[PDB]
Enzyme design. Structure first.
Site, mmCIF file in Angstrom:
data_model
loop_
_atom_site.group_PDB
_atom_site.id
_atom_site.type_symbol
_atom_site.label_atom_id
_atom_site.label_comp_id
_atom_site.label_asym_id
_atom_site.label_seq_id
_atom_site.Cartn_x
_atom_site.Cartn_y
_atom_site.Cartn_z
ATOM 1 N N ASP A 272 -11.399 9.697 10.977
ATOM 2 C CA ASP A 272 -11.175 9.462 9.580
ATOM 3 C C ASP A 272 -11.327 8.009 9.217
ATOM 4 O OD1 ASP A 272 -10.706 10.149 6.956
ATOM 5 O OD2 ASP A 272 -8.488 10.252 7.143
ATOM 6 N N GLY B 277 0.826 -1.209 0.000
ATOM 7 C CA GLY B 277 0.000 0.000 0.000
ATOM 8 C C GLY B 277 0.847 1.241 0.000
ATOM 9 N N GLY C 253 3.903 8.105 2.251
ATOM 10 C CA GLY C 253 4.982 7.152 1.907
ATOM 11 C C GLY C 253 4.461 5.778 1.528
ATOM 12 N N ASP D 73 -7.690 -4.037 3.119
ATOM 13 C CA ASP D 73 -8.692 -3.060 3.500
ATOM 14 C C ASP D 73 -10.107 -3.437 2.945
ATOM 15 O OD1 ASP D 73 -7.014 -1.422 1.156
ATOM 16 O OD2 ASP D 73 -9.184 -1.234 0.978
ATOM 17 N N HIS E 209 -12.724 5.961 7.144
ATOM 18 C CA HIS E 209 -13.219 5.526 5.857
ATOM 19 C C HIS E 209 -12.835 4.085 5.594
ATOM 20 C CE1 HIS E 209 -9.226 5.884 3.972
ATOM 21 N NE2 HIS E 209 -9.095 7.086 4.587
ATOM 22 N N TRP E 210 -13.389 3.502 4.529
ATOM 23 C CA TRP E 210 -13.269 2.070 4.344
ATOM 24 C C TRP E 210 -11.901 1.612 3.878
ATOM 25 C CZ3 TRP E 210 -16.736 -0.164 -0.275
ATOM 26 C CH2 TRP E 210 -16.570 0.619 -1.414
ATOM 27 N N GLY E 211 -11.002 2.554 3.570
ATOM 28 C CA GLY E 211 -9.611 2.197 3.376
ATOM 29 C C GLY E 211 -8.838 2.019 4.706
HETATM 30 O O1 LIG Z 1 -1.187 4.660 9.573
HETATM 31 C C1 LIG Z 1 -1.348 3.560 10.251
HETATM 32 O O2 LIG Z 1 -1.842 3.557 11.419
HETATM 33 C C2 LIG Z 1 -1.176 2.269 9.520
HETATM 34 C C3 LIG Z 1 -1.084 1.115 10.298
HETATM 35 C C4 LIG Z 1 -1.005 -0.135 9.727
HETATM 36 C C5 LIG Z 1 -1.016 -0.291 8.351
HETATM 37 C C6 LIG Z 1 -1.029 0.850 7.551
HETATM 38 C C7 LIG Z 1 -1.106 2.116 8.130
HETATM 39 O O3 LIG Z 1 -1.149 3.276 7.392
HETATM 40 C C8 LIG Z 1 -1.076 3.145 5.944
HETATM 41 C C9 LIG Z 1 -2.402 2.711 5.341
HETATM 42 O O4 LIG Z 1 -2.346 2.408 3.917
HETATM 43 C C10 LIG Z 1 -2.023 1.059 3.591
HETATM 44 C C11 LIG Z 1 -3.280 0.257 3.413
HETATM 45 N N1 LIG Z 1 -3.176 -1.190 3.563
HETATM 46 C C12 LIG Z 1 -2.588 -1.957 4.526
HETATM 47 C C13 LIG Z 1 -2.649 -3.355 4.494
HETATM 48 C C14 LIG Z 1 -2.166 -4.124 5.528
HETATM 49 N N2 LIG Z 1 -1.654 -3.470 6.583
HETATM 50 N N3 LIG Z 1 -1.251 -4.043 7.777
HETATM 51 C C15 LIG Z 1 -0.939 -2.936 8.470
HETATM 52 C C16 LIG Z 1 -1.120 -1.682 7.811
HETATM 53 C C17 LIG Z 1 -1.577 -2.066 6.569
HETATM 54 N N4 LIG Z 1 -2.010 -1.291 5.529
#
Ligand SMILES: O=C(O)c1ccc2cc1OCCOCCNc1ccn3ncc-2c3n1
Ligand code: NA
Length: 329
Positions: free
Chosen positions: A180, A22, A27, A142, A182-184
């Site tokens: 915030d 992701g 970043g 997500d 949202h479904w992401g």
């Molecule tokens: O900001 C945090 O609290 C945050 C904490 C955990 C993860 C990502 C985060 O932020 C970035 C989100 O965008 C990526 C979306 N998808 C996935 C998929 C699988 N994981 N497992 C952990 C995270 C993750 N993110």
């Protein structure tokens, strides 16, 4: 003691197993394997003058609030009176200094070729660049990406129940508002547990999982407090946040501002109700299920979720919803 090299958090084996999962303006996020276990690595450039993904980098002081909040919420898995595993586990935080590892650029390129990226290729950072590297529990995929992948509205009910309980526990312990959701920002992963456990103000209960564990993520806009010290994002002078269109999501920012009279330091747990409403609306209007409500018992769950959607905005918090709403009885 000071910043560490990337190879401190990402020894070569760990680095060689990184795959990108992701991204955002902040970043990049990678999945890797440590001790036979998946983890998620979020990497954020800080303190430098270069635009990254079109925006200025956060200072250490600007990024700290979301790190503090992450930790407080992760710590609820080990509490007693107010206990939940429904927020993403935070394993470690490091400040790293260096250019971007070539193995991570390879991972970035593969994602770009297969899924496409909105970000800059992170190959322009010099050897003095600082980053925060956060290692999280691997939370799965997500909800938005699972739009066509869930079994049935029984699964939707479990997800809503999990989210409501986790928000309630965080309201009770920390006066928490996500702000915030949202479904992401709702992650789903498989579990073999048939039921999940939480404790709210000393009273424990269980939630049927339908084979999924929910994890809440992304605290950039969130607010909480301990012993009267409030950690929150002051968006009172932001313009763009309140001028979005095309999805109910953008109404929720405006509706929160209405609720709080544009004072973001205060506690208004109704914002959690507003996000749950938005999420329920997504479940009924955008999700599509592999098995529809084809039997009496399933048509009844559909009707109860429809009733939730029509009634939940008359509740004052996630705590009020969990304890009083008929959906959860
Ligand atoms: O900001 C945090 O609290 C945050 C904490 C955990 C993860 C990502 C985060 O932020 C970035 C989100 O965008 C990526 C979306 N998808 C996935 C998929 C699988 N994981 N497992 C952990 C995270 C993750 N993110
Ligand atoms: Na968790």
């Amino acid at each position: 003691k000071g910043p560490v090299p990337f190879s401190h958090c990402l020894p070569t084996e760990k680095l060689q197993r990184c795959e990108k999962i992701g991204e955002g303006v902040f970043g990049e996020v990678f999945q890797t394997i440590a001790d036979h276990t998946p983890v998620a690595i979020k990497i954020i450039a800080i303190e430098g003058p270069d635009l990254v993904n079109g925006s200025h980098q956060k200072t250490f002081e600007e990024i700290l609030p979301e790190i503090i909040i992450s930790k407080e919420l992760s710590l609820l898995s080990g509490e007693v009176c107010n206990r939940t595993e429904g927020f993403i586990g935070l394993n470690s935080v490091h400040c790293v200094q260096g250019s971007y590892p070539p193995l991570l650029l390879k991972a970035w390129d593969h994602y770009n070729s297969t899924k496409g990226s909105a970000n800059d290729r992170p190959d322009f950072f010099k050897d003095d660049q600082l980053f925060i590297v956060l290692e999280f529990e691997f939370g799965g995929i997500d909800l938005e990406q699972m739009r066509t992948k869930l079994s049935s509205l029984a699964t939707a009910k479990s997800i809503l129940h999990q989210l409501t309980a986790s928000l309630a526990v965080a309201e009770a312990s920390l006066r928490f508002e996500h702000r915030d959701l949202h479904w992401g920002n709702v992650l789903l992963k498989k579990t073999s547990l048939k039921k999940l456990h939480y404790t709210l103000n000393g009273k424990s209960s269980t939630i049927p999982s339908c084979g999924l564990q929910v994890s809440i993520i992304d605290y950039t806009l969130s607010r909480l407090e301990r012993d009267g010290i409030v950690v929150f994002c002051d968006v009172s002078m932001d313009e763009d946040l309140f001028t979005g269109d095309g999805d109910y999501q953008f109404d929720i920012y405006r509706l929160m501002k209405k609720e709080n009279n544009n004072r973001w330091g205060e506690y208004h747990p109704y914002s959690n109700v507003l996000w749950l409403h938005y999420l329920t609306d997504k479940m009924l209007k955008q999700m599509t299920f592999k098995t529809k409500c084809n039997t009496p018992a399933m048509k009844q769950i559909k009707r109860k979720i429809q009733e939730f959607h029509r009634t939940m905005l008359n509740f004052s918090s996630a705590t009020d919803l969990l304890c009083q709403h008929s959906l959860f009885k």
